[PDB]
Amino acid sequence: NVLVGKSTVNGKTYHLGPQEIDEIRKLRLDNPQKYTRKFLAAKYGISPLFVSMVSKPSEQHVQIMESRLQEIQSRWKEKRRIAREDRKRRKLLWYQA
RNA sequence: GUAGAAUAAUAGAUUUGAAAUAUUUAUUAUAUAGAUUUAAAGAGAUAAUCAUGGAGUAUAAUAAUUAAAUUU
Numbered sequence: 387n388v389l390v391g392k393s394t395v396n397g398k399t400y401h402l403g404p405q406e407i408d409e410i411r412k413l414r415l416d417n418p419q420k421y422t423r424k425f426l427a428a429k430y431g432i433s434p435l436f437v438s439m440v441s442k443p444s445e446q447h448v449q450i451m452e453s454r455l456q457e458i459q460s461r462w463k464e465k466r467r468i469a470r471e472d473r474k475r476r477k478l479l480w481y482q483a
Numbered sequence: 484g485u486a487g488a489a490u491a492a493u494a495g496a497u498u499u500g501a502a503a504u505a506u507u508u509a510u511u512a513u514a515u516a517g518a519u520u521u522a523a524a525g526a527g528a529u530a531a532u533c534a535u536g537g538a539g540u541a542u543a544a545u546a547a548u549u550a551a552a553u554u555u
């Protein structure tokens with residue numbers, strides 16, 4: 387197998403209920419730093435994709451991490467910026483087929 | 484147009500499927516192994532912008548008289 391998902395290796399599970407899904411949401415909105423996607427996935431035996439599906443982080447959290455991305459991009463040099471645009475175009479060309 | 488029906492966005496609302504081939508889907512650093520790429524101090528070719536040079540071209544008094552052709 388190549389880049390296979392864990393659920394695909396061992397099939398999907400449907401075992402969480404409304405109350406613990408709601409409390410997952412409360413934890414995520416409370417302390418996104420302490421209760422990360424991987425932490426919640428480990429705690430509740432689900433996938434980080436499912437955590438993102440059911441929960442939603444805080445606006446402050448997303449704003450600060452977008453700013454972090456902006457800083458990392460700004461610290462780049464000319465060559466890395468061009469290389470990243472090239473990666474984007476190449477990846478887009480993957481799907482045209 | 485003294486006015487309405489008539490495309491897409493931009494967002495909004497109300498619904499909507501999923502545990503979503505996410506131990507890499509999007510993008511983000513380090514380390515190891517390996518494979519590579521990227522010059523313009525100047526130059527060639529071509530074109531253009533400035534020159535240089537004076538080939539080529541026109542004219543050889545351009546006044547006036549005579550003659551043929553014209554607006555009123």
Ligand SMILES: [Mg+2]
Pocket residue numbers: none
């Ligand atoms: Mg070059």
Ligand SMILES: [Mg+2]
Pocket residue numbers: none
């Ligand atoms: Mg000259």
